[PDB]
Design a protein around this ligand. Structure first.
Ligand SMILES: O=N[O-]
Ligand SMILES: O=N[O-]
Ligand SMILES: O=N[O-]
Ligand SMILES: [Cu+2]
Ligand SMILES: [Cu+2]
Ligand SMILES: [Cu+2]
Ligand SMILES: [Cu+2]
Ligand SMILES: [Cu+2]
Ligand SMILES: [Cu+2]
Ligand SMILES: [Cu+2]
Ligand SMILES: [Cu+2]
Ligand SMILES: [Cu+2]
Lengths: 300, 300, 300
């Protein structure tokens, strides 16, 4: 199922290019590209990606920012596109395909705070998402979250599935072969990883005893819902889709639809390693367990 | 799997009969009947229906109305029944079977506002729902919704699945063959369609640039949950199950359980065509994409 | 898939041992043990259990209680452990394995009110949960629920799945063979049952006409989400995860993630039998229907 023009193609990852161009305007450039990713040990997936990552690179903007987004398509044969769930846009004008070896620029506002999925909008969308063209954009609320002052440390986690390679029958009728977490960096020194079964087990996220941790999370699917849970704690506060108004307290587990996001906050009271799972345990067994290592210093 | 007495049977659809009989009392009559529906192009399903539609015809009542419901059973051999999720009733007295060629009348109050599933209660209920005996009843809140004055246009959407014809093994162990949206008319001129893979793509719902749209939605299943999302917008306000108290804001995607409902509202800011999906993309690929065409005038 | 050391093993159920040892401290002792349970008529599952029940015995504590938990492992060969979702603990110190024929004691606080899953934490956790090592701990809120004074009668229900016996491939890739409810006693005279397809149909929970019923519910999975619904009523009030702050009203159906809990309350207005389902009807057909028998006296 590897089309002829993708055989042997492995386009090196490139950094996200993003810069502020006004008090409420930002530029973002990504590149659709075909990149080999090791999704499980010994298992390479020649992913359809933004910038050579799957999920793609994290985007963070402020509520009220207009995004002037450029997609460069490095794929030699397949068109690609971008749909940000954060934005108000005309899908048939603003989320349209960019042909191989071309670029397109689209402009649209991010009016709403939260933790939004982004993904390719090219038909069949299932094929583009399943092959790796998904990611998260965070829109920071102008008025913050009411618990901001309580948070000591924060990370981003994303859940996705992987199927048999570029197999539309499997994508629409089969169980996922792997379900995985990745983490995308918010600040210098944070890990930045791809959706695989092992990295966040072997290189756990780090925290310090007694801290309140915030996670910005999204389940990008393509197909499954997520029962998000941190072992050994309870979520003090949850904001559904990251909108400050959608405020729950004391949740053991947060139900995320496909493309669903949340801001979750919890306290780690003792040193140790804390697993992070989807509690749909078939998916956890197939890769969807990350680890948080809590030490007396917060360093390894 | 087409029982002998249903071979060749295709009972013409009939309109819903409903009339108000007091300030807080309504009469409703439906007919259980066997009707061929084209669920995908070239694919006829000899559905078990209310009134020859699947999902069945929309019912709208006011909070506090008592419903005097009559079911006429036109099926030559299978008993059928009605369960409205809106009502407080004794299931073993009020949701009981009506035999072939008979009628039954049942009375019960709709005390609670919202967007409720209805379906046959005859065992096996899975068989009756999967074969098409599902629908929505809307109960309008006595005090409205706090965002009523902001809404410019409204429609009803229903999600359902279709399986291999009358195949209980597939119904309980197989993936859906199709997942579909339909729209049921609230006002004269609104579309009224059945659950199929194509009608709401080829004949999109219509709206005008700048409008706030309300959708009354329910995922009737039988089996799947729904990750309901409108491309190119964000839900300004969501009322879970259509109860005004269950008020979320700024949701990208609304998680609906099987039988779950919602009132969702969103703004369309630019001309274009806006897909409406379940973001469980295996289901979207198998039919569950509707379209909203937004024009400068709101007409086609 | 019955390991040699479990052949012929059927360890008799034993009562939960629990006692208060201070105003905010309790002792609890359980025993990991291998016990034959009839999950469907004629179908024995040699379950991995706490105390010979699956789901395990109900635990009820007060918000702010510290639990001094002892696990005795009667399994001749497999290690087992305990993870309470109620507690703040170090998973790698406090949820660790107890070897065959050994005991371990762990201490941790239940700081948060609600209806929490508990289960074994031994890897693979999917295997331990699927084989029966799941249950519920209720933590009573110090300030109650705002609707406490309206409730006439209460019960606990738990949803779980059963798969092919000890079959890891089926656990992670197959549909459940059975999906079931059980009820765990809160007060003397309440039923106390295991997850099976039939007991709560043949011996329904009892209530009286006009009562407001509270159910403490949790869907322990391992793998499925639940669309929890009581036929013939609407939930007056719902508290997600049993936290009083997470308060919804007038819900027809409550979406529970895997491990998700709730307190749900509803009124039964007429005599009759009221089914209780997950509205994912493939699961209901495979066992997940319980009954509530409502009589003029509340007795049978
Ligand atoms: O609570 N994680 O199994
Ligand atoms: O956001 N619809 O893929
Ligand atoms: O509403 N139970 O089918
Ligand atoms: Cu610009
Ligand atoms: Cu793509
Ligand atoms: Cu999307
Ligand atoms: Cu009448
Ligand atoms: Cu029927
Ligand atoms: Cu129902
Ligand atoms: Cu002690
Ligand atoms: Cu165990
Ligand atoms: Cu758990």
């Amino acid at each position: 199922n590897v089309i002829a023009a993708h055989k042997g193609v492995n386009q090196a990852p490139v950094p996200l290019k993003m810069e502020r161009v006004g008090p409420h305007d930002v530029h973002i450039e990504m590149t659709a590209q075909i990149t080999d990713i090791e999704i499980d040990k010994g298992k390479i997936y020649k992913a359809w990606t933004f910038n050579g990552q799957a999920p793609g690179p994290l985007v963070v903007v402020n509520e009220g920012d207009t995004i002037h987004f450029t997609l460069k398509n490095m794929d030699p044969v397949v068109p690609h596109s971008m749909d940000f769930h954060a934005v108000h846009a005309s899908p048939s004008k603003d989320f349209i395909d960019v042909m191989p070896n071309k670029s397109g620029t689209f402009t649209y506002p991010a009016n709403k705070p939260g933790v939004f999925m982004y993904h390719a909008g090219t038909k069949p969308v299932l094929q583009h998402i399943a092959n790796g063209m998904h990611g998260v954009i965070i829109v920071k609320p102008k008025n913050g979250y009411p618990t901001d002052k309580e948070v000591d440390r924060e990370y981003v986690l994303i859940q996705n599935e992987w199927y048999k390679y570029n197999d539309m029958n499997d994508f629409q009728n089969g169980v996922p072969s792997y379900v995985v977490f990745s983490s995308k960096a918010l600040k210098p020194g944070d890990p930045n990883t791809n959706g695989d079964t092992f990295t966040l087990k072997e290189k756990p996220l780090l925290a310090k005893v007694g801290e309140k941790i915030r996670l910005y999370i999204n389940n990008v699917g393509p197909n499954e819902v997520s029962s998000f849970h941190v072992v050994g704690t309870v979520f003090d506060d949850v904001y559904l889709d990251g909108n400050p108004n959608n405020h729950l307290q004391g949740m053991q587990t947060v139900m995320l639809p496909a493309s669903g996001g949340a801001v979750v906050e919890f306290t780690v009271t003792r040193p140790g390693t804390y697993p992070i799972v989807t509690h749909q345990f078939n998916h956890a067994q197939k890769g969807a367990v990350a680890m948080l290592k809590v030490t007396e210093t917060g360093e390894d």
